[PDB]
Design a protein around this ligand. Sequence first.
Ligand SMILES: [Ca+2]
Ligand SMILES: [Ca+2]
Length: 161
Amino acid sequence: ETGIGQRIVCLVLDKSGSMATGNRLNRLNQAGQLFLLQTVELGSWVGMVTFDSAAHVQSELIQINSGSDRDTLAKRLPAAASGGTSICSGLRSAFTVIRKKYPTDGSEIVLLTDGEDNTISGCFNEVKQSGAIIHTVALGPSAAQELEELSKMTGGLQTYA
Ligand SMILES: [Ca+2]
Ligand SMILES: [Ca+2]
């Protein structure tokens, strides 16, 4: 959070090729739309990162004060799935997005992914150091175990699992 009590949240959204399977990308978009249009509270700072093998900042931190802010974030949810997978690239990019304004300690990441990534341990240290809270939504059934561990070690919530 900010020093004055505003939530800091970065959506980290898996748009990799595996997400083309089934309805995974539609479920990601549904979850992202619910979060952006209904759940996140007035006054929160909110950023958005997509990732395949590399991270793409869809939005720097912007504050939710109007329905236009929700809408402008929701219009940037990924339309298509392609490329490789690096959860860690997406999380590092989220940390950079947050740290343009604020510390990451007590900030939140909403990680929407199928979890099919066996290199997650590679950012454990950075994640522990960040103090961020990683919420994970597993959108497939073959999620690595390190996805859960991202949540467990940061105090985040786990869902679809
Ligand atoms: Ca607080
Ligand atoms: Ca993938």
